Amino acid sequence: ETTVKIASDSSYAPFEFQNGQKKWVGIDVDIMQEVAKINDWKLEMSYPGFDAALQNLKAGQVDGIIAGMTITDERKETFDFSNPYYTSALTIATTKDSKLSDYSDLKGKAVGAKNGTAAQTWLQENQKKYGYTIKTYSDGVHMFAALSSGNIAGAMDEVPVISYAMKQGQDLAMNFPSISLPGGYGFAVMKGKNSTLVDGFNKALAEMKSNGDYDKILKKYGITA
């Protein structure tokens, strides 16, 4: 009878984004809506931005997150996750005119990531190996504005998000290797809390994968998994 409050990122096409009429759409939006329908939940979406969503979840202000959020072992110390619903892979986006193409080219350069993200964690873990500096951003609009302006030499983010932006004509390229994160994207709750939501997400996701509806969602955004 209570409302299920789910927070998401503010600009993360094709997973959550505003269309030309300002309506919130995307793969995550459609999946969560159909999960709620299957479970007869009252769903309340919010789109505060990824790191803000994490803070709201930690505060109990929302009950869960869906936001292209990679499942990782370190994250499982703080969150419980659903089964994965999409593959996860990171790469360094540059402008199209950049000639940087290998991680070794980043020595002494600034590389961006969004605060709270698996991308930020990768940059921290690999800084001693490659020797860049790290800049962090509240959301994708700020990170990619830093990239386009030239204040960072690269921006680490998910391959499907960068690719989709490129297909819209944005001044982005993917010259670097991809980093597979095997956990995939998951629906997240605070660890030890809201198991009813995780269970409902898992059962609905399996039904949607089995019955073809998951694939129809991806098709709306041009994608065959």
Residue 30 CA, distance from chain mean position: 15
The amino acid present at 1, given as its one-letter code, is E
- Residue pair 143/9 in contact (Cβ under 8 Å)? The answer is no
User: Tokens representing 37?
Assistant: 């329908």
Distance of alpha carbon 189 from alpha carbon 151, whole angstroms: 35
Are the C-beta atoms of 123 and 155 separated by less than 8 Å?
no
- Do 14 and 80 reside in the same domain of the chain? yes
106 and 152 both lie in a single domain: yes
Number of domains making up the chain? 2
- What's the N-to-C CA distance of the chain in angstroms? 35
Q: Say what the resolution is, in angstroms.
A: 1.7
CATH code assigned at 149: 3.40.190.10
Within this chain, do residues 18 and 71 fall inside the same structural domain, yes or no? yes
Which of 192, 172, 153, 188 has the alpha carbon at shortest distance from 9? 188
**CA dihedral for 80, 83, 85, 89, sign (positive or negative):** positive
Integer CA distances (angstroms), 147 to 12, 51, 109, 115, in order: 16, 19, 12, 15
Residue 15 shares a structural domain with residue 72: yes
The encoded tokens of residue 127 equal: 């800084």
Task: Return d(Cα 38, Cα 207) in angstroms, integer.
Answer: 9
Q: Are 158 and 68 in contact (CB under 8 A)?
A: yes
Whether 6 contacts 64, CB under 8 Å: yes
Question: For residues 35 and 64, is the Cβ–Cβ distance under 8 A?
Answer: no
Which range marks the domain in which residue 152 is found?
A: 88-183
How far from 211 is each of 40, 119, 133, 216, CA to CA, in Å? 18, 33, 46, 10
List residues in the chain that are followed by a break over 2.5 Å (C to N): none
What does the H/E/C string look like for the chain? CCEEEEECCCCECCCEEECCCCCEECHHHHHHHHHHHHHCCEEEEECCCHHHHHHHHHCCCCCEECCCCECCCCHHHCEEECCCCEEEEEEEEECCCCCCCCHHHHCCCEEEEECCCHHHHHHHHHHHHHCCEEEEECCHHHHHHHHHHCCCCEEEEEHHHHHHHHHCCCCCECCCCCEEEEEEECCEEECCCCHHHHHHHHHHHHHHHHHCHHHHHHHHCCCCC
Strand order in the sheet with 179-185: 133-137, 110-114, 154-158, 86-93, 179-185
Q: Does residue 188 share a domain with residue 167?
A: no
**Tokens in use for 210?**
């089995």
Measured CA to CA, the distance from residue 16 to residue 56 in angstroms comes to 18
Q: How far is CA 131 from CA 100, 156, 161, in A?
A: 14, 15, 26
Gyration radius of the chain's alpha carbons: 17
192 in the same domain as 175: no
Structure-solving method: X-ray
